[PDB]
């Protein structure tokens, strides 16, 4: 009697190679890998590289398409009513672009509101609210940002409200990021986000083709 101590690495290695090959072809819902004949051999465009770089950075079984929707330019007349103040910033999204991004509200699975925080000196508590039609705001989330000397991306889980925007939502609905104004003292958002790049919305959704 002798218990084995040598584990054959090549056999399990090829086993996991075949398993992950099957897994990649299974989540992508592809029987065969696609053909590069109908692909221009171009360095990938800047938009797709921006998609991949945004989804790489951090803070159902099958694969899900990732699409970014850029928050509407501050120069637009939508932000004339909601001016960027010292206590709140506003991030409005054209929901039409959300719907060419995700065609069906059922298809949406995860939505993240992405901000790019600049250098921060003191720890800042921020609250994220969702705009209603009758100029009211429902609380959505609280984030405590520790101070840092580098710009970092910040993600807010907004999957439910983005699904509500796709199904029941309007056109130019958005969010507000304010400072935590307690019941005793007023506060200000010393936090500076770029362009009020600019914040955007990352959508991981099941494609309608699969």
């Amino acid at each position: 009697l002798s218990t084995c101590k040598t584990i054959d690495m090549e056999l399990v290695k090829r086993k996991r190679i075949e398993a992950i090959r099957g897994q990649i072809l299974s989540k992508l819902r592809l029987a065969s890998p696609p053909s590069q004949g109908e692909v221009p051999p171009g360095p990938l465009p800047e938009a797709v590289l921006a998609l991949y770089n945004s989804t790489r950075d951090r803070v159902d079984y099958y694969a899900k398409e990732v699409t970014r929707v850029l928050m509407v330019e501050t120069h637009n007349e939508i932000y004339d009513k909601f001016k960027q103040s010292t206590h709140s910033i506003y991030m409005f999204f054209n929901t039409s672009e959300l719907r060419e991004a995700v065609p069906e509200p059922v298809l949406l699975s995860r939505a993240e509101l992405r901000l790019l925080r600049l250098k921060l000196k003191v720890e800042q508590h921020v609250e994220l609210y969702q705009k209603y039609s009758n100029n009211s705001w429902r609380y959505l989330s609280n984030r405590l940002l520790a101070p840092s000397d580098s710009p970092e991306w910040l993600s807010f889980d907004v999957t439910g409200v983005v699904r509500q925007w796709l199904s029941r939502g309007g056109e130019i609905e958005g969010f507000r990021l304010s400072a935590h104004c307690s019941c005793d003292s007023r506060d200000n958002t010393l936090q500076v986000d770029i362009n009020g790049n600019r914040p955007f919305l990352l959508l991981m959704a099941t494609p309608l083709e699969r």
Partner: antibody
Framework: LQLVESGGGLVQPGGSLRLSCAAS????????MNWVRQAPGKGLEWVSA????????YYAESMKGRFTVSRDNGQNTLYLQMNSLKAEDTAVYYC??????????????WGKGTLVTVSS | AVVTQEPSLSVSPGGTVTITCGLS?????????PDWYQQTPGQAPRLLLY???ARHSGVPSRFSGSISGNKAALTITGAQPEDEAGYYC?????????????FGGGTLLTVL
């Protein structure tokens, strides 16, 4: 929360008229505002819209230029001056409160409407 | 473009009926936001549905909006005699020079 409109009546062909709309129970600064018209016995026809401030307007193609929509939020009043009014513009006009600061969310509330009759 | 509805229809009380609204040029999506209004003759129209799904405050849950195929659908389940009225569809698209709403010839829903 109610809307009252005025200015309807008899106008000669190629005439001029200025409808007026005043509301209570809400704020004009928060909502877009729509003008709709309905021919007597026929269907509705969306006429115009104006957003929360009043600097940018939206018009229907059959009457763009002939109709000028405007606001005044100080006394909460609203105007649709109809210039070069033609013979096909006779209708009941409803001033309507929209649902948001944009053309989306529907005309949330409607007014009673004023009859504008064009004839000689 | 021109918004097309059926001219009229009838439904037995307690049944399920579907009023339907389309464009002659292309499809409807949720981006072509269908607003559904009801009008009793001699009365100002009342908003029923907006943004393809959402009911106005005070609208009973019988009326439900959706996108059926290439057209926008309002479904009434369990009709009642006071539902006999003109139903209108407002579609938000790029109409000509600017972008705005447009109405269609409303359906005179008459409950049998």
């Amino acid at each position: 929360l109610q809307l009252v409109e005025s200015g309807g009546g008899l106008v000669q062909p190629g005439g001029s008229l200025r409808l007026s709309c005043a509301a209570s129970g809400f704020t004009f600064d928060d909502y877009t505002m729509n003008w709709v018209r309905q021919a007597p016995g026929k269907g509705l026809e969306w006429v115009s819209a104006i957003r929360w401030n009043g600097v940018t307007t939206y018009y229907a193609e059959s009457m763009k230029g002939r109709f000028t929509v405007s606001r005044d939020n100080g006394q909460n009043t609203l105007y649709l001056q109809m210039n070069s009014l033609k013979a096909e513009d006779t209708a009941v006009y409803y001033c309507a409160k929209g649902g948001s600061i944009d053309l989306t969310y529907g005309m949330d509330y409607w007014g009673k409407g004023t009859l504008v009759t064009v004839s000689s | 473009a021109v918004v097309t509805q059926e001219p009229s229809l009838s439904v037995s009380p307690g049944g399920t009926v579907t009023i339907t609204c389309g464009l002659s040029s292309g499809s409807v999506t949720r981006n072509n936001y269908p607003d559904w209004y009801q009008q009793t003759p001699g009365q100002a129209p009342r908003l029923l549905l907006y943004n393809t799904v959402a009911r106005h405050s005070g609208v009973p849950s019988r009326f439900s909006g959706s996108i059926s195929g290439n057209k926008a659908a309002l479904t009434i389940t369990g009709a009642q005699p006071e539902d006999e009225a003109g139903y209108y569809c407002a579609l938000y698209m790029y109409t000509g020079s600017n972008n705005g709403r447009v109405f269609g010839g409303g359906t005179l829903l008459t409950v049998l």
